[PDB]
Amino acid sequence: MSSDGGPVLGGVEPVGNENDLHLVDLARFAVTEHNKKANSLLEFEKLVSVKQQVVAGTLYYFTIEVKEGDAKKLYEAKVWEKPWMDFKELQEFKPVDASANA
């Protein structure tokens, strides 16, 4: 006995458990989509975790790791899907190699 209101009450929530086929789909999708317009470049190894943010839709910060060429690191796969209209579109899945501040 325990239930009241949706399992949502905030934003930026940590998650993971590849057990969620959907979650992985996003990360695995990124590498794919990317390999499409990039004719491939790296080799996805697996998924570490994934977050979720609420805004103009449904955002998820996937933190997977892939071995690029002769290297290995983690790429932040960010996807934006919409249930109200069952949609989705890869935003970018990379460790974001850039440093700035203003």
Swiss-Prot record:
Recorded GO CC terms: extracellular region
S-S pairs: none
Protein's cellular compartments: Secreted
Site (Reactive site) residue list: 10
Domain of life: Eukaryota
Location of the Cystatin domain: 10-97
Motif position, Secondary area of contact: 53-57
One BP term from GO: defense response
Molecular function via GO: cysteine-type endopeptidase inhibitor activity
Record flagged with keyword Signal: yes
Biotechnological applications: Introduction by genetic manipulation and expression in potato or banana confers resistance to insects and nematodes.
Main location: secreted
Keywords: Plant defense, Protease inhibitor, Secreted, Signal, Thiol protease inhibitor
Function as written in the Swiss-Prot or TrEMBL entry: There are two distinct cystatins in rice seeds (Oryzacystatin-1 and -2) with different specificities against cysteine proteinases. May be involved in the control of germination by inhibition of endogenous cysteine proteinases. May play a role in defense by inhibiting exogenous proteases such as those present in digestive tracks of insects and nematodes.
Entry's family note: Belongs to the cystatin family. Phytocystatin subfamily.
Name assigned to this protein: Cysteine proteinase inhibitor 1
First and last residues shown, out of full length: 39 to 140 of 140
